[PDB]
Design a protein around this nucleic acid. Sequence first.
DNA 1: GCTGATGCGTC
DNA 2: GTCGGAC
DNA 3: GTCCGACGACGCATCAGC
Length: 642
Amino acid sequence: SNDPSGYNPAKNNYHPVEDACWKPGQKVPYLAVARTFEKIEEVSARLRMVETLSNLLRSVVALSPPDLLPVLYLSLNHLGPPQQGLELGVGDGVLLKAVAQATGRQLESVRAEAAEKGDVGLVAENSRSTQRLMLPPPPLTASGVFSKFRDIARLTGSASTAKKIDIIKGLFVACRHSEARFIARSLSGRLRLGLAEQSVLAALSQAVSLTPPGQEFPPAMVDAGKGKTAEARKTWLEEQGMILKQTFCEVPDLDRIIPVLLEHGLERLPEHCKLSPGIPLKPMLAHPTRGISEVLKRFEEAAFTCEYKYDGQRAQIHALEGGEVKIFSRNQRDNTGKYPDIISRIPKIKLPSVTSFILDTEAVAWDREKKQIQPFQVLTTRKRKEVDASEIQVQVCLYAFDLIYLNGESLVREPLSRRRQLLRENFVETEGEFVFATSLDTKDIEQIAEFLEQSVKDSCEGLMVKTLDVDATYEIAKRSHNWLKLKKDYLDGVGDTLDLVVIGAYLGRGKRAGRYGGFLLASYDEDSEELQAICKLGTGFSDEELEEHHQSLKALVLPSPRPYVRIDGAVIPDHWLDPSAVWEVKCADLSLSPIYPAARGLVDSDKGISLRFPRFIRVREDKQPEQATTSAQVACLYRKQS
DNA sequence: GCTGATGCGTC
DNA sequence: GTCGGAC
DNA sequence: GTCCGACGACGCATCAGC
Ligand SMILES: *P(=O)(O)OC[C@H]1O[C@@H](n2cnc3c(N)ncnc32)[C@H](O)[C@@H]1O
């Protein structure tokens, strides 16, 4: 209809035709998407966000079906299917430079304003573009903006950054109302709607259920739920939602799903898009569990297995009928070129009767000389793409723990008891190359506890716990976190805690805007009587605790750092703090840092020590900096990881 | 042709 | 990756 | 329990700057 600026997709009794802000066949205006983001961000109830997005999507289906795919990608802040590897190459650095040039302001003024407001979108929105003529360019369209994002991502090579900035400046010149806010957030990778993949899928299945695609215009059926009771409508939308969710979890690729959805409908979708080797799928995840008693409470009387939780990276290995092999990451990225050693070993791990499979494994760095597992840090030094087999320096051992597909059979609906038996019988172990995850089938608390201790002694993070027959399938759509993860450092009073000094604070972004979002911490070097930065910290405190931190550190702000505080290459804090507050901090491991100075020279000549997965536990009101954990104590903790 | 800063992915 | 907030 | 977005260390790949 008329004037996107007034578009209200949160409206009660939203009518997909009469309440749209564009006419049939027209391109969806980007302002329509921006206004939808505004109405989503204004509320906290996830179900209300879904309804609002569904309203937009229903208008897109009814009026401009070719724009459904770009509108969906804009709402997820994706560029396309993950296995295609498109990357903007734009962070806050490029973005802030483009905003400075677009608005004619100094880069430093823009950087300072972004940090104080905690959002680059607000800076871009509230400053005019000095490249704008008297008469604006035509309004942005959803598909136009999406295509420009893709243009940015495809620019490569020398002088490519300047070309990316030119595209961004062009977008800002054409923005109206709130559009610049969401372009900027999207480019920075921080859309921060409160609505993401699961809510987008729920909105999509609701939208195509209520307003079916493919109708002759004007659509005879704009609300297919209106003839049902509230109860019947809810059950129906839940069923339709699960059809979409389960297909997506097997084929998480909107380029494949959306054309089928528009042509054949949601009910026929599983017939056209099915799990198959060569198409990455969503992996099964794990829920953190803070004790053995919590495990037994979660699984009740269902038999379960405990497995070592190996410290590497996930590798989803696909063997296609015909011999081709592909390897994908946890997030559906193509890692095939990264593992020529693994690909060459596939004939060695599968019996000759296996014609196709999808394996779920952990790739762990392996020292062939000493025949033992190596830390994650070592694994991350492998090259990432177009790697040749002879050039591999860090060997990998695969620890296999699941089987999702075998000889043409999808196993997603099969219980782990059967998947595991098929894994054990059709694949071959080779020490230090391909091994089944160490496992224990028991319900005895004393055995589980001992097994947890042994997993740590054997260079693992803890245990994974999985039911064998009750709710034991690989249906991510039913429950994405169907497994449990049990780590020692989850236990209170157990694991490595340090008492560290707060030496700086960083202004918060997003949910943390208007206060501190992070802090710089330091250990005390006895030998030089200096405080050495050891890590940053940004999780572990409640919202109330964070407000107390803000009020207790405000009096410690210094304009300039103390000469006995050393941070070297760490990110300079927005506010320096007089060393006084001491906090108890927990971590999973200690790592060798190329940047932090803490304990430098005590374990390595060039590298200090930092914390893996640090989190705030509590303030140490009874400690001053002189009694904080020493750099020598940090080195001793690092060494005993062996 | 090299180095550092930036981006993005891994955990 | 950990964590807490909102539902 | 689910979903989400605050925030963590770290390393390769890339490209601006030299
Ligand atoms: P996150 O800490 O949420 O844990 C899940 C990941 O752990 C890895 N992993 C290692 N060993 C296993 C076993 N035995 N089973 C399942 N997952 C395991 C995977 O890479 C998961 O992504």
